Protein backbone atom coordinates (compact mmCIF):
# COMPACT_ATOMS: atom_id res chain seq x y z
CA UNK A 1 0.00 0.00 0.00
CA UNK A 2 1.80 3.01 1.51
CA UNK A 3 3.98 3.23 -1.60
CA UNK A 4 4.44 0.58 -4.45
CA UNK A 5 7.50 -1.61 -3.77
CA UNK A 6 6.51 -0.68 -0.22
CA UNK A 7 7.32 -2.97 2.68
CA UNK A 8 9.62 -5.32 0.65
CA UNK A 9 13.01 -5.03 2.31
CA UNK A 10 16.09 -5.18 0.08
CA UNK A 11 18.17 -7.22 2.60
CA UNK A 12 15.39 -9.69 3.41
CA UNK A 13 12.26 -9.96 1.28
CA UNK A 14 14.00 -9.03 -1.98
CA UNK A 15 16.53 -11.87 -1.40
CA UNK A 16 14.24 -14.33 0.32
CA UNK A 17 16.17 -14.01 3.67
CA UNK A 18 14.09 -14.12 6.93
CA UNK A 19 15.14 -11.83 9.85
CA UNK A 20 15.93 -13.40 13.19
CA UNK A 21 12.51 -12.87 14.83
CA UNK A 22 10.00 -12.34 12.05
CA UNK A 23 8.80 -15.97 12.43
CA UNK A 24 7.57 -14.95 15.95
CA UNK A 25 5.09 -12.50 14.32
CA UNK A 26 3.90 -14.94 11.64
CA UNK A 27 3.25 -17.73 14.17
CA UNK A 28 1.00 -15.33 16.15
CA UNK A 29 -1.24 -14.81 13.12
CA UNK A 30 -2.17 -18.44 13.65
CA UNK A 31 0.79 -19.45 11.55
CA UNK A 32 0.95 -17.20 8.48
CA UNK A 33 1.23 -17.64 4.70
Amino acid sequence: SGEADCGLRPLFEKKSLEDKTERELLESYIDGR
Binding site: S1, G2, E3, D5, C6, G7, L8, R9, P10, L11, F12, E13, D19, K20, T21, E22, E24, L25, L26, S28, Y29, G32, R33
Partner: protein
Protein backbone atom coordinates in the same frame (compact mmCIF):
# COMPACT_ATOMS: atom_id res chain seq x y z
CA UNK B 1 12.92 0.28 23.77
CA UNK B 2 12.76 -1.85 26.97
CA UNK B 3 13.73 -5.54 26.78
CA UNK B 4 14.38 -5.33 23.05
CA UNK B 5 17.26 -6.65 20.98
CA UNK B 6 19.53 -4.93 18.53
CA UNK B 7 18.09 -4.52 15.09
CA UNK B 8 20.04 -6.38 12.35
CA UNK B 9 21.18 -4.19 9.41
CA UNK B 10 18.41 -3.30 6.90
CA UNK B 11 15.71 -4.85 9.15
CA UNK B 12 13.56 -1.66 9.35
CA UNK B 13 14.57 0.52 6.39
CA UNK B 14 11.67 2.99 6.84
CA UNK B 15 13.03 3.90 10.32
CA UNK B 16 13.66 7.63 10.64
CA UNK B 17 15.46 9.85 13.22
CA UNK B 18 13.77 13.15 14.17
CA UNK B 19 16.83 15.17 15.01
CA UNK B 20 17.21 18.59 16.57
CA UNK B 21 19.39 21.14 14.82
CA UNK B 22 20.60 22.72 18.12
CA UNK B 23 20.99 21.35 20.63
CA UNK B 24 21.81 18.53 18.17
CA UNK B 25 19.58 15.86 19.76
CA UNK B 26 17.39 12.83 19.18
CA UNK B 27 13.84 14.11 19.18
CA UNK B 28 11.70 11.13 18.14
CA UNK B 29 11.22 8.33 15.71
CA UNK B 30 9.33 8.67 12.46
CA UNK B 31 8.80 6.46 9.39
CA UNK B 32 9.31 6.73 5.60
CA UNK B 33 6.00 6.20 3.73
CA UNK B 34 7.26 7.45 0.33
CA UNK B 35 10.27 9.22 -1.19
CA UNK B 36 9.09 12.66 0.14
CA UNK B 37 6.83 11.95 3.16
CA UNK B 38 7.41 11.05 6.75
CA UNK B 39 4.95 9.85 9.42
CA UNK B 40 5.40 10.65 13.13
CA UNK B 41 3.26 11.46 16.24
CA UNK B 42 2.05 15.09 16.61
CA UNK B 43 3.23 15.05 20.21
CA UNK B 44 6.81 15.16 18.74
CA UNK B 45 6.22 18.61 17.28
CA UNK B 46 3.52 20.23 19.41
CA UNK B 47 2.92 19.74 23.10
CA UNK B 48 2.08 23.14 24.64
CA UNK B 49 1.92 22.11 28.31
CA UNK B 50 5.64 21.52 27.87
CA UNK B 51 6.20 24.53 25.68
CA UNK B 52 7.01 22.21 22.72
CA UNK B 53 6.11 23.73 19.32
CA UNK B 54 8.77 22.79 16.72
CA UNK B 55 8.70 24.38 13.23
CA UNK B 56 10.23 22.98 9.98
CA UNK B 57 13.38 24.90 10.82
CA UNK B 58 14.20 23.31 14.03
CA UNK B 59 14.71 19.95 12.54
CA UNK B 60 16.65 17.56 10.49
CA UNK B 61 15.44 14.14 9.37
CA UNK B 62 17.96 11.30 9.20
CA UNK B 63 17.21 8.16 7.12
CA UNK B 64 19.01 4.80 6.91
CA UNK B 65 20.60 4.87 10.34
CA UNK B 66 21.82 2.02 12.58
CA UNK B 67 24.18 3.77 15.11
CA UNK B 68 22.13 6.03 17.43
CA UNK B 69 24.93 8.64 17.74
CA UNK B 70 27.27 8.43 14.76
CA UNK B 71 27.20 10.16 11.41
CA UNK B 72 26.84 7.03 9.11
CA UNK B 73 29.08 8.54 6.48
CA UNK B 74 27.86 6.90 3.27
CA UNK B 75 24.82 5.05 4.58
CA UNK B 76 22.50 7.68 6.16
CA UNK B 77 20.76 10.52 4.34
CA UNK B 78 19.83 13.75 6.14
CA UNK B 79 16.96 16.01 4.99
CA UNK B 80 15.33 19.32 5.39
CA UNK B 81 11.60 19.57 5.97
CA UNK B 82 9.60 21.60 3.49
CA UNK B 83 6.39 21.82 5.56
CA UNK B 84 4.84 20.11 8.63
CA UNK B 85 1.17 18.97 8.96
CA UNK B 86 -0.65 18.05 12.17
CA UNK B 87 -4.14 16.45 12.46
CA UNK B 88 -6.36 19.52 12.79
CA UNK B 89 -8.11 17.63 15.67
CA UNK B 90 -5.09 16.27 17.51
CA UNK B 91 -6.19 16.46 21.20
CA UNK B 92 -3.16 17.62 23.10
CA UNK B 93 -5.53 19.02 25.75
CA UNK B 94 -6.79 15.68 27.03
CA UNK B 95 -5.60 12.23 25.78
CA UNK B 96 -3.33 12.48 22.73
CA UNK B 97 -6.30 11.48 20.48
CA UNK B 98 -5.18 11.69 16.82
CA UNK B 99 -1.49 11.76 17.75
CA UNK B 100 -0.24 11.91 14.14
CA UNK B 101 1.71 14.27 11.88
CA UNK B 102 3.05 14.30 8.34
CA UNK B 103 6.34 15.88 7.22
CA UNK B 104 7.11 16.53 3.59
CA UNK B 105 10.81 16.58 2.76
CA UNK B 106 12.39 19.37 0.66
CA UNK B 107 13.81 16.74 -1.75
CA UNK B 108 12.82 13.13 -2.37
CA UNK B 109 15.16 10.52 -0.95
CA UNK B 110 16.75 7.76 -3.02
CA UNK B 111 16.08 4.21 -1.90
CA UNK B 112 18.97 1.88 -1.11
CA UNK B 113 19.47 -1.31 0.88
CA UNK B 114 19.10 0.83 4.03
CA UNK B 115 16.29 3.11 2.91
CA UNK B 116 12.88 1.79 1.83
CA UNK B 117 9.27 2.83 2.54
CA UNK B 118 6.84 0.91 4.68
CA UNK B 119 3.23 0.29 3.42
CA UNK B 120 0.12 1.97 4.78
CA UNK B 121 -2.66 -0.53 5.45
CA UNK B 122 -5.80 -0.98 3.43
CA UNK B 123 -9.11 -1.52 5.10
CA UNK B 124 -8.82 -5.31 4.57
CA UNK B 125 -5.22 -5.56 5.80
CA UNK B 126 -6.18 -3.76 9.02
CA UNK B 127 -9.13 -6.01 9.69
CA UNK B 128 -7.24 -9.25 9.33
CA UNK B 129 -4.16 -8.17 11.27
CA UNK B 130 -5.40 -5.89 14.01
CA UNK B 131 -6.40 -8.71 16.37
CA UNK B 132 -5.83 -9.30 20.09
CA UNK B 133 -2.86 -11.66 20.49
CA UNK B 134 -1.29 -10.81 17.05
CA UNK B 135 2.28 -9.52 17.42
CA UNK B 136 3.64 -6.32 15.91
CA UNK B 137 7.22 -4.94 16.01
CA UNK B 138 8.31 -1.57 17.39
CA UNK B 139 11.74 0.00 16.76
CA UNK B 140 13.67 3.02 18.04
CA UNK B 141 16.69 4.49 19.73
CA UNK B 142 14.73 5.25 22.93
CA UNK B 143 15.20 4.51 26.60
CA UNK B 144 16.43 1.09 27.58
CA UNK B 145 14.96 1.55 31.01
CA UNK B 146 12.14 3.52 32.51
CA UNK B 147 14.78 5.02 34.80
CA UNK B 148 20.48 4.14 29.03
CA UNK B 149 20.42 5.00 25.37
CA UNK B 150 21.25 2.12 23.03
CA UNK B 151 24.21 2.28 20.77
CA UNK B 152 22.24 0.63 17.93
CA UNK B 153 18.58 0.61 16.93
CA UNK B 154 16.46 -1.59 19.24
CA UNK B 155 13.57 -3.90 18.42
CA UNK B 156 10.80 -5.70 20.25
CA UNK B 157 7.70 -7.71 19.20
CA UNK B 158 4.48 -7.40 21.28
CA UNK B 159 0.93 -8.78 21.00
CA UNK B 160 -2.03 -6.44 20.41
CA UNK B 161 -4.24 -6.48 23.59
CA UNK B 162 -8.06 -6.44 23.90
CA UNK B 163 -9.85 -3.07 24.16
CA UNK B 164 -11.27 -3.72 27.67
CA UNK B 165 -7.87 -4.63 29.08
CA UNK B 166 -6.59 -1.41 27.55
CA UNK B 167 -9.44 0.60 29.12
CA UNK B 168 -9.10 -1.07 32.55
CA UNK B 169 -5.39 -0.20 32.93
CA UNK B 170 -5.53 3.57 32.85
CA UNK B 171 -7.60 6.54 34.05
CA UNK B 172 -6.96 8.19 30.61
CA UNK B 173 -9.85 8.02 28.14
CA UNK B 174 -8.97 5.61 25.21
CA UNK B 175 -10.57 6.56 21.82
CA UNK B 176 -11.13 4.44 18.72
CA UNK B 177 -8.06 6.19 17.21
CA UNK B 178 -5.79 4.29 19.62
CA UNK B 179 -4.80 0.67 20.44
CA UNK B 180 -2.60 -0.71 23.24
CA UNK B 181 0.08 -3.37 23.13
CA UNK B 182 2.24 -5.38 25.45
CA UNK B 183 2.43 -8.55 27.40
CA UNK B 184 0.34 -9.37 30.39
CA UNK B 185 1.77 -9.91 33.87
CA UNK B 186 0.55 -13.50 33.58
CA UNK B 187 2.38 -14.10 30.31
CA UNK B 188 5.70 -13.03 31.77
CA UNK B 189 7.44 -11.92 28.53
CA UNK B 190 8.21 -8.16 28.62
CA UNK B 191 9.11 -5.09 26.60
CA UNK B 192 7.64 -1.85 25.45
CA UNK B 193 8.66 1.44 23.83
CA UNK B 194 10.08 4.19 26.04
CA UNK B 195 10.66 7.89 25.89
CA UNK B 196 12.67 8.76 22.82
CA UNK B 197 10.87 5.90 20.94
CA UNK B 198 7.79 8.13 20.35
CA UNK B 199 6.57 8.78 16.83
CA UNK B 200 8.06 5.47 15.69
CA UNK B 201 6.41 2.68 13.73
CA UNK B 202 4.41 -0.33 15.07
CA UNK B 203 4.70 -2.68 12.05
CA UNK B 204 3.19 -5.98 10.99
CA UNK B 205 4.17 -8.44 8.19
CA UNK B 206 1.15 -9.49 6.09
CA UNK B 207 1.02 -13.27 5.87
CA UNK B 208 -0.88 -12.89 2.50
CA UNK B 209 1.51 -10.68 0.57
CA UNK B 210 4.53 -10.87 2.92
CA UNK B 211 4.78 -7.11 2.97
CA UNK B 212 5.32 -4.90 6.04
CA UNK B 213 2.54 -2.61 7.07
CA UNK B 214 2.62 0.25 9.56
CA UNK B 215 -0.41 -0.22 11.91
CA UNK B 216 0.49 2.15 14.73
CA UNK B 217 2.59 5.10 15.81
CA UNK B 218 4.32 5.03 19.26
CA UNK B 219 2.11 7.41 21.24
CA UNK B 220 1.98 7.47 25.07
CA UNK B 221 2.08 5.12 28.07
CA UNK B 222 2.59 5.37 31.84
CA UNK B 223 6.27 4.57 32.60
CA UNK B 224 7.96 1.86 30.37
CA UNK B 225 7.58 -1.93 30.90
CA UNK B 226 5.47 -1.58 34.08
CA UNK B 227 3.38 -4.75 34.84
CA UNK B 228 -0.36 -4.43 34.20
CA UNK B 229 0.24 -1.34 31.95
CA UNK B 230 0.45 -1.05 28.14
CA UNK B 231 1.83 1.06 25.35
CA UNK B 232 -0.63 3.08 23.27
CA UNK B 233 -0.30 3.92 19.57
CA UNK B 234 -2.19 5.95 17.02
CA UNK B 235 -4.42 3.70 14.86
CA UNK B 236 -2.97 4.39 11.39
CA UNK B 237 -5.86 2.84 9.47
CA UNK B 238 -8.41 5.01 11.13
CA UNK B 239 -6.49 8.13 10.11
CA UNK B 240 -5.71 7.01 6.58
CA UNK B 241 -8.21 9.38 4.96
CA UNK B 242 -6.63 12.46 6.53
CA UNK B 243 -3.29 11.14 5.22
CA UNK B 244 -4.47 10.64 1.58
CA UNK B 245 -6.10 13.97 1.83
CA UNK B 246 -2.91 15.83 2.72
CA UNK B 247 -0.76 13.86 0.27
CA UNK B 248 -3.40 14.67 -2.36
CA UNK B 249 -3.75 18.38 -1.42
CA UNK B 250 0.02 19.13 -1.21
CA UNK B 251 2.93 16.90 -2.24
CA UNK B 252 4.55 14.08 -4.15
Amino acid sequence: IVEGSDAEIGMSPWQVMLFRKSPQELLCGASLISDRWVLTAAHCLLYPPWDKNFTENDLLVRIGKHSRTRYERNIEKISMLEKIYIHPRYNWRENLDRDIALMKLKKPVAFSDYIHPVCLPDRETAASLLQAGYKGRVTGWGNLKETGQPSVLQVVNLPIVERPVCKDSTRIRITDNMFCAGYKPDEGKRGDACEGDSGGPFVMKSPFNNRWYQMGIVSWGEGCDRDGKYGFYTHVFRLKKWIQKVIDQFGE
